């Protein structure tokens, strides 16, 4: 989309994704390779794409420390008190 007083490419957006191998499509700019680590992917690094699958990693990180989850839950939800 385009506008006057600019180009709609400057608009900050976050879309929710449901696949890891689907994030490269959001970024118009060329990337080094199709097979790019999700963390290394330009759209993820910019923070314009939230994949739902990285939350699956938190079950690992909650396993090794009992306090990661309450830290994220109080940092993010804004005082999710019981």
């Amino acid at each position: 989309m385009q506008f006057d007083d600019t180009t709609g490419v400057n608009i900050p957006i976050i879309t929710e994704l449901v696949n890891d191998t689907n994030v490269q499509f959001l970024d118009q700019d060329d990337d080094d390779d199709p097979d790019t680590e999700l963390y290394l992917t330009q759209p993820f690094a910019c923070g314009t794409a939230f994949a739902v699958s990285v939350l699956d990693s938190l079950m690992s990180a909650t396993y090794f420390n009992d306090n990661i989850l309450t830290l994220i839950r109080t940092l993010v939800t804004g005082g999710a008190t019981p």
Partner: protein, 355 residues
């Protein structure tokens, strides 16, 4: 499996070798037999393959007894331990692998919904007898394995068609079909579905994926609506001028009917003008004899001579008709102000521009 096979084989060979070297206790070891261990291994490999030469055989009754028990033990090992495990090493993949990039073979990758009905017409009017210089090897890529009818169809076109299983979203699968180097990739679409915005947006997704892999490929796709085709101009890598074109089934299919409502039968002309159809010479004075004299006419694009520049359009049509017997349906007028816009039967007021 190989270790337990070799261990059982060598163990039983050693046991029957020890039995056949000595004699028999009830015969007081008077019935020996001289067997080297390698000949004995030859014996119990000839046995468990059910060949049974008999050049070397057991001569002790205690040895024959162990052979009777051991062939039953070998079958009990063969019928109950291996024959499901052999079948686990028997699932060979039907449609895998990759494409062998033969030089001079610009392999068209065709993806999207693939079925005998949709592919057959396309294969019949693409790989036709009356083509000029077809050295082009069609590479289908689709995740659903085909039924037996498509097996029979792909067997008919063996030298030109290769099928592969997998999506066009995994870029590894695009790496298998060598999408990076191909003349163009054509994405087909189903004629029918429950929701046209399902397969429309799925084909837009496939266009996004294929242009994301290699941004310099021509894609000729299909759409089912007109209001979903504006999503193809969305992509920055999609250049229509570069030759990436989208054919809208709804606009063309139900535009031909609309122009036919004006001129009764224009659909037959504009369908026989582009399908590579075989002329059958009919001698008998039927209607087909007059019909097939226009089927063999097709449409071409051509730059103009310099001598035609500056003249008027009916003058150049008059020269191209009487002098060269060629009908010029339309011309392309290119200006800085606007993108060149095809003009059909341009009026005399419009004159020819150079080139």
């Amino acid at each position: 499996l190989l270790s337990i096979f070799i261990s059982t084989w060598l163990t039983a060979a050693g046991f029957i070798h020890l039995v056949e070297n000595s004699g028999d206790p009830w015969e007081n070891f008077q019935n020996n037999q001289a067997l080297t261990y390698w000949e004995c291994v030859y014996l119990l490999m000839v046995t468990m393959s059910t060949v049974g030469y008999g050049d070397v055989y057991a001569k002790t009754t205690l040895g024959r007894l162990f052979m009777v028990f051991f062939i039953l033990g070998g079958l009990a090992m063969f019928a109950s331990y291996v024959p499901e495990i052999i079948e686990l090493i028997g699932n060979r993949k039907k449609y895998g692998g990759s494409y062998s990039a033969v030089s001079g073979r610009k392999h068209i990758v065709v993806c999207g919904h693939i079925t005998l009905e949709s592919v057959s017409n396309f294969l019949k009017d693409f790989l036709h007898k009356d083509r000029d210089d077809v050295n082009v090897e069609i590479v289908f890529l689709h995740n659903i394995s085909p039924n037996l009818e498509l097996e029979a169809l792909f067997k008919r076109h063996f030298t030109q068609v290769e099928f592969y299983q997998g999506s066009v979203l995994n870029p590894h699968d695009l790496a298998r079909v060598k999408i990076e180097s191909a003349d163009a990739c054509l994405i087909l679409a189903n004629k029918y579905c429950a929701d046209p915005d399902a397969e429309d947006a799925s084909n837009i997704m496939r266009v996004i994926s294929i242009k994301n892999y290699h941004p310099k490929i021509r894609i000729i796709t299909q759409m089912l609506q007109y209001h979903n085709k504006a999503h193809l101009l969305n992509i920055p890598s999609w250049n229509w001028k570069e030759g990436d074109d989208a054919i809208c089934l709804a606009e063309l299919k139900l535009g031909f009917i609309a122009q036919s409502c004006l001129a009764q039968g224009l659909s037959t002309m504009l369908a026989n003008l582009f399908s590579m159809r075989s002329f059958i010479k009919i001698e008998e004075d039927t209607w087909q004899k007059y019909y097939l004299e226009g089927v063999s006419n097709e449409m071409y694009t051509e730059y103009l001579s310099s001598a035609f520049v500056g003249l008027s359009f009916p003058t150049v049509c008059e020269l191209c008709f009487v002098k060269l017997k060629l009908l010029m349906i339309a011309i392309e007028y290119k200006s800085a102000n606007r993108e060149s816009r095809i003009l059909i039967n341009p009026g005399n007021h419009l004159k020819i521009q150079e080139g």
